[PDB]
RNA sequence: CGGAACUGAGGCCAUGAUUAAGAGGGACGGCCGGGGGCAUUCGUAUUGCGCCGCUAGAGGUGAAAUUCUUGGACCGGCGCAAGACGGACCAGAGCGAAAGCAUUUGCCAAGAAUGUUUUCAUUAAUCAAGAACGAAAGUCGGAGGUUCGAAGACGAUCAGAUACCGUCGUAGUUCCGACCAUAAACGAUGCCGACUGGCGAUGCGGCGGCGUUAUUCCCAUGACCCGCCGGGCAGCUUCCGGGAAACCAAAGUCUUUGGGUUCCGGGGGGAGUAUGGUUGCAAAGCUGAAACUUAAAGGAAUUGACGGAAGGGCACCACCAGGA
RNA sequence: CAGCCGCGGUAAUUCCAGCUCCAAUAGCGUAUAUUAAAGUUGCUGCAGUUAAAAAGCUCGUAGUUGGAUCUUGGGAGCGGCCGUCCCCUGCUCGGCGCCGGCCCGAAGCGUUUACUUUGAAAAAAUUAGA
RNA sequence: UAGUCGCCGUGCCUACCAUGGUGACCACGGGUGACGGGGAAUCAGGGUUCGAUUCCGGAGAGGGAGCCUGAGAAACGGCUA
RNA sequence: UCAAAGUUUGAGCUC
């Protein structure tokens, strides 16, 4: 049965992606999912999606821009200590310089480096560059 | 095409498409006021009524079920309702 | 993997023990049978006495004629054609006296013509044969 | 997907997103009850009842027009079965093929059907021995099945 | 390698169909592999016709016809050369040509 | 006046029950289908018999004989007979868990799929152990024994043929009742779930829409006709991208590598052998090693060479027509 | 001779010698176990149409995984629309004490895990390291 | 359950009752060229193998067994078979 | 509208 509906929706929008489509609708909407792409959009690597409410779980619709390479998700959701934080972030991403692992913690949804400042462990989410 | 207003599709376009697949899914059947010319009272028929739906005080039959919609007796009108 | 599961560390550890003998070579180092078959027993050398020379002809394209040596070994009683390798070194082994053979660098597996020789003489009479060829010593008579 | 079949149809009932009651209507809750009163004494299920209640009267669903559902109204008055409807139904199934098979000892594919057939009552039992219907005791036994209907 | 999609057969729903003995073999064939050739002909083709035609009595006086069905083996076939050979590229090309012949 | 159990009737609490999943089960409506079982009906041909007609060969092959035949063969007509088989209609069509499933009619129950503002509200997916089914041959009993036909014999060619050809012909081939569980059981492609190109055709259910055409006298049905919807067997198509290539809208969404879960492979041989264990009346099935030897074994595709495979074209050291 | 490919059948760049030349240098050679190299046992990280490979099919308890849904925000002051510092439990004895009441301090009680951060606690030797 | 012994708690031992406990989360049984650990070798990151061996803990002085003496021994450079 | 057609010094091919 449909387990993970991240899962789904990211694979969803690299195929987008890949073919340069415009807008892009998502059939089921979670909480965590919506989380994720407000922190994407207040670093701007994408553009005003909207959500369509019903009495159900909802849909959404991204009005994709073309700055994003790929948008990546790790299952099973490892926790990740701050010993291993650096081997995960240098084995998975592109280089020192960009690319980011956002991973919900107790202090709440973040990026690994702001989880650097805040001092901060916890469950790895996903990924993106 | 490229852009889609997949938020703003046509009337039209809700209709031509799979009662989920609407951009809100909605159902395809509906309530009905039917009416034979001699007894009084409006019958509030459903549209597949999988029942033999007859009239007030017994008096004759309207409906005979069939797979979808319901082929009404002969000389019997009727009214599609709204809300 | 294909069970990415968080709580199948069991059945993962389970496989992997069991394919790890699928593998020919770790079969091959951890029962006991090809140790023991081994008359040299996990040993580079072993010590053995010379009870005839024999001429084994070589293989196809090439064409010789080997000169082995039928040794018995002491401890187990078990019997080898070391193989004498250099030009005119036979002259020296005499029959009825103690070499100390080596392998062959291949761990079980035959070389080249010499079928089925995986040994080679080093010593005869605590004299080594490399002086004796060379002609800095001499045997002791 | 089904369960134990290969097709994979998607055919169901679609509610639609106003769960407001519509302009014409105007019966109440207590008469409906008043009429299920009558149609479970008479002796009818929560289905039946439901599909009269659209054709006739035009009423769609009762979990909309009024706050409650139908089988907890029923249950309220005692009127609800010993088990459920849907294990009556499939024990009834049970029992028929059982029987076409007592002369028919042939009908392979007849014995194939019934054993998936107590594979789901199994597993549905299991589902209302956790929802704390059933007793622990309850067992489907073929001897002592067919005197459930 | 795969040489043909279709295994020179017509079975890709199904599963097993009756076997036919051959006419010039007997070699059993699966009805669905097997070439089918509905001829219907006449007892009298065109030379003979014209010939017989001088035996009958009637003047034109319309002749019955031989309405066969014909099944063949395939190194039959070959060798009774009704079928050739074809390329790699050509095999495809799974259109009869027109009523030409 | 304080602290434990028991027991009567209050006032107030907004008084108490998350939605109904393009998760699933169960119900309903008319359909659909070589879907299954049992019983019932029909057809020719078949080989056999009985009878009648003319008659000397019939058979069979590349060419012949054993074979049947003037004690009437073969051929034709009319009757009878038993068991196989249900052609042609029959499709790049349907249904079934899979093998597979097609003479008429009747009985029994089921089910995928469809329409649905039907009920319950997480009841679900995949699975060692365990279990049901599982073509042909084989085996044990009966029943039945028409055809073909392992074995076998003989007759033919042939250097040999204990084969390919022929005449006979046993077990088997048919039904019921008992075992068995193996095939290239192939799409050689595990199951669910999502997403990313078209195009026409088709089968089912459903919906809509000028007009033709039967019911005939309209309706509402039937056959055409033009469309839309769901999933379904297939087809074509392209620089989507992948892939060693052959190829695939899946064998894609992979060094930009993790949606879920079973099984299973790690050089060739030795060897699916041995030994052990288990099943089976037997046949055999299942689990399943080692020694020793050995440097290669294979796949796709290119160019040759060959071809008792086909298509084209030429030559009196080829033929054809002939000559020394 | 040659770990392997291969060399040697009368001008041998491959043998035995001489003549030279190379690597390392008081050290080098040979053998065996073993490790990286091995994305040839793969959790990170392999394969399974045709190179070796998917149980003939379906059922099935343990095993493994499982849809959505309940707290979002608020007050005062701060820095260059934006960010951050200050705050977001409740239910017997005395003083910031003030004119029996109010607050605070203290004692006891708190529906429950995984997860994450601190400290203590860690035998030395060893390792890194001032 | 009640005692014995023992410095105390306990099938440690004795007697009388009850009939329990473990098992696909691999017990039970068999093997181990296994004393254990602190550590060593190797390495990108993950890991792999080794570790009798000068520090700690255990066991042992031909094989098994038994004991006096002593605060402390079932001692072996103390005894009896 | 299908009877058959076997072999070839040991005495030296090749980037
Ligand atoms: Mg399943
Ligand atoms: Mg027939
Ligand atoms: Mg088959
Ligand atoms: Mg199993
Ligand atoms: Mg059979
Ligand atoms: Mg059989
Ligand atoms: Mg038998
Ligand atoms: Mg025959
Ligand atoms: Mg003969
Ligand atoms: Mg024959
Ligand atoms: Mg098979
Ligand atoms: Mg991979
Ligand atoms: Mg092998
Ligand atoms: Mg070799
Ligand atoms: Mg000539
Ligand atoms: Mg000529
Ligand atoms: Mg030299
Ligand atoms: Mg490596
Ligand atoms: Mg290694
Ligand atoms: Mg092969
Ligand atoms: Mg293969
Ligand atoms: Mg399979
Ligand atoms: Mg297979
Ligand atoms: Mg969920
Ligand atoms: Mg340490
Ligand atoms: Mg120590
Ligand atoms: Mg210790
Ligand atoms: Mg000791
Ligand atoms: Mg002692
Ligand atoms: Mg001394
Ligand atoms: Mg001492
Ligand atoms: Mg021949
Ligand atoms: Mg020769
Ligand atoms: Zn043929």
């Given at each position: 049965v449909r387990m993970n509906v991240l899962a789904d929706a990211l694979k969803s929008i690299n195929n987008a992606e890949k073919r340069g489509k415009r807008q892009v609708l998502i059939r089921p909407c979670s909480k965590v999912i919506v989380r994720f792409l407000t922190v994407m959009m207040k670093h701007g690597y994408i553009g005003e999606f909207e959500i369509i409410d019903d009495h159900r779980a909802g849909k959404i619709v991204v009005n994709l821009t073309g700055r994003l390479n790929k948008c990546g998700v790790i299952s099973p959701r490892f926790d990740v200590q701050l010993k291993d934080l650096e081997k995960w972030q240098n084995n998975l991403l592109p280089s020192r310089q960009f690319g980011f692992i956002v991973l919900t913690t107790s202090a709440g949804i973040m990026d690994h480096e702001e989880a650097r400042r805040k001092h901060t462990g916890g469950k790895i989410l996903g990924f993106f560059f | 095409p490229l852009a889609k207003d997949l938020l703003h599709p046509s009337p039209e376009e809700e209709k031509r498409k799979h009662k989920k697949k609407r951009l809100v899914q909605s159902p395809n059947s509906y309530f009905m006021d039917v009416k034979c010319p001699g007894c009084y009272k409006i019958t509030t028929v459903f549209s597949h009524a999988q029942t033999v739906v007859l009239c007030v005080g017994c008096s004759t039959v309207l409906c005979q079920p069939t797979g979808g919609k319901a082929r009404l007796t002969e000389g019997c009108s009727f009214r599609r309702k709204q809300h | 993997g294909k069970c990415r599961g968080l709580r199948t560390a069991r059945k993962l550890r389970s496989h992997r023990r069991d394919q790890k003998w699928h593998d020919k070579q770790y079969k091959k180092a951890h029962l006991g049978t090809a140790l023991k078959?081994?008359?040299?027993?996990?040993?580079?050398?072993?010590?053995?006495?010379?009870?005839?020379?024999?001429?084994?002809?070589?293989?196809?394209?090439?064409?010789?004629?080997?000169?082995?040596?039928?040794?018995?070994?002491?401890?187990?009683?078990?019997?080898?054609?070391?193989?004498?390798?250099?030009?005119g070194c036979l002259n020296f082994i005499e029959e009825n006296d103690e070499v100390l053979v080596a392998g062959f660098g291949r761990k079980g597996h035959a070389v080249g013509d010499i079928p089925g020789v995986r040994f080679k003489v080093v010593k005869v009479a605590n004299v080594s044969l490399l002086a004796l060829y060379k002609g800095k010593k001499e045997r002791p008579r | 997907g089904r369960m134990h079949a290969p097709g994979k149809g998607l055919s169901q009932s679609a509610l639609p997103y106003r769960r407001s009651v519509p302009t014409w209507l105007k019966l109440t809750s207590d008469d409906v009850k008043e009429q299920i009163y009558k149609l479970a004494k008479k002796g009818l299920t929560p289905s039946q009842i439901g599909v009269i209640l659209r054709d006739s009267h035009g009423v769609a669903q009762v979990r909309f027009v009024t706050g409650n559902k139908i089988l907890r109204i029923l249950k309220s008055k005692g009127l609800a079965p010993d088990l459920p409807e849907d294990l009556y139904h499939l024990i009834k199934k049970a029992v028929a093929v059982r029987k076409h098979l007592e002369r028919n000892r042939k009908d392979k594919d007849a014995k194939f059907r019934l054993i998936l057939i107590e594979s789901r009552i199994h597993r549905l039992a299991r589902y209302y021995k956790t929802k704390r219907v059933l007793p622990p005791n309850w067992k489907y036994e073929s001897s002592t099945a067919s005197a459930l209907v | 390698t795969k040489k043909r999609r279709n295994n020179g057969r017509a079975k890709k729903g199904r599963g097993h169909v009756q076997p036919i003995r051959c006419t010039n073999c007997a070699r059993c064939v699966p009805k669905d592999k097997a070439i089918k050739k509905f001829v219907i002909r006449n007892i009298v083709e065109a030379a003979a016709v014209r010939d017989i035609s001088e035996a009958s009595v009637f003047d034109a006086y319309v002749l019955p016809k031989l309405y066969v069905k014909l099944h063949y083996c395939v190194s039959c076939a070959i060798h009774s050369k009704v079928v050739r050979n074809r390329s790699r590229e050509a095999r495809k090309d799974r259109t009869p040509p027109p009523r030409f012949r």
């Open positions: - | - | 078959a081994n008359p040299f027993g996990g040993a580079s050398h072993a010590k053995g006495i010379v009870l005839e020379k024999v001429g084994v002809e070589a293989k196809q394209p090439n064409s010789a004629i080997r000169k082995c040596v039928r040794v018995q070994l002491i401890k187990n009683g078990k019997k080898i054609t070391a193989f004498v390798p250099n030009d | - | -």
